Amino acid sequence: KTISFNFNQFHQNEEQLKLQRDARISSNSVLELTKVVNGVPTWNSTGRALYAKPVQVWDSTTGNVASFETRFSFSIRQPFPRPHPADGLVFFIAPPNTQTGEGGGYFGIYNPLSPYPFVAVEFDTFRNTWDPQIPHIGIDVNSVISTKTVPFTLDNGGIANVVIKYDASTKILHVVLVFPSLGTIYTIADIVDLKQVLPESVNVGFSAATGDPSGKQRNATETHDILSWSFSASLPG
């Protein structure tokens, strides 16, 4: 049972994508997770993009767990250096049919009033009380307080290539971050037992957020654009 899809670009009204909140697809085919008006990103924005169909990461009958690989390109343009850009974007897996969570440092995937489990890879740009120096790549399991973290230097407005791979047999989740214009390579890995944290069927997608109003800083913002994306998952079941 192999499931896969590929988007070299994004078209408006794409039937295989579920856009939520501020998420929208632009004319020039880029997936803009957070709000951008007249070429300028605003604060108080939150958006998600889910692959319309659910994917099966494990089977209770056989006990088998799926292995998967996903690649995508994103771009984060930080127009206002001071006081501080916010908040970042993440790739995530969660139960099907969830709603957008809290914005800000929660990226729109965590909802304290009705927490739902999730596994996510974050590209954190703002330093919250629970964060190490930013920007950083982080592996999140049911929480925004990463299990593993690695710092990286952003290529403002540049293109970033990401490769995320999950090995069911070793339970290793390894992500690679590359900024082709700078030739920089960042790597991070950790052990995650999907069968233990998530249900058999899940949704895969992205979520991002800009500065929260409570910070009283309209400059706390940046873009969170997804340029392309492919996914592939295999269940030996």
Ligand X SMILES: OC[C@H]1O[C@H](O[C@@H]2[C@H](O)[C@@H](O)[C@@H](O)O[C@@H]2CO)[C@H](O)[C@@H](O)[C@H]1O
Ligand Y SMILES: *[C@@H]1O[C@H](CO)[C@@H](O[C@@H]2O[C@H](CO)[C@@H](O)[C@H](O)[C@H]2NC(C)=O)[C@H](O[C@@H]2O[C@@H](C)[C@@H](O)[C@@H](O)[C@@H]2O)[C@H]1NC(C)=O
Ligand Z SMILES: *[C@@H]1O[C@H](CO)[C@@H](O)[C@H](O[C@@H]2O[C@@H](C)[C@@H](O)[C@@H](O)[C@@H]2O)[C@H]1NC(C)=O
Ligand U SMILES: *[C@@H]1O[C@H](CO)[C@@H](O)[C@H](O)[C@H]1NC(C)=O
Q: Is 157 in the site for ligand Y (CB under 6 A)?
A: no
Contact present, 185 and 176 (Cβ < 8 Å): yes
Q: Is 44 in the site for ligand Z (CB under 6 A)?
A: yes
Tell me phi and psi for residue 20, to 5 degrees.
Answer: -130, 145
Which of 27, 82, 114, 133: binder of ligand Y (CB under 6 A)?
A: 82
Provide the 3-class DSSP secondary structure of residue 205: strand
Nearest residue to ligand X on Cβ basis:
215
Q: Which is nearer to a second copy, 18 or 174 (CB)?
A: 174
Residue 214 interacts with which of Ca ion, ligand Y, ligand X, none, CB < 5 to 8 Å by class: ligand X
Q: Is 178 in the site for a second copy (CB under 8 A)?
A: yes
Strands of 22-159 (E only): list them.
24-25, 31-32, 36-37, 40-41, 46-51, 55-56, 67-75, 87-94, 119-124, 136-141, 148-151
Q: Is 124 in the site for Ca ion (CB under 5 A)?
A: yes
For residue 233, with 0-12 CB atoms within 10 Å meaning exposed, 13-18 middle and 19 or more buried, which class applies? Answer: buried
Q: Pattern 123-142, binding to Mn ion, x per CB under 5 A?
A: -x------x------x----
Residue 61 interacts with which of ligand Z, ligand X, ligand Y, none, CB < 5 to 8 Å by class: none
Q: Which is nearer to a second copy, 77 or 171 (CB)?
A: 171
Q: Going by C-beta distance under 8 Å and a sequence separation of 6 or more, which residues neighbour residue 184?
A: 152, 153, 155, 178
Residue 3 interacts with which of ligand U, a second copy, Mn ion, none, CB < 5 to 8 Å by class: none
How far apart, in whole angstroms, are the C-alpha atoms of residue 150 and residue 183?
17
- Site residues, ligand X (CB under 6 A): 86-87, 104-105, 126, 128, 211-212, 214-215, 217, 220
- Site residues, ligand U (CB under 6 A): 44, 213
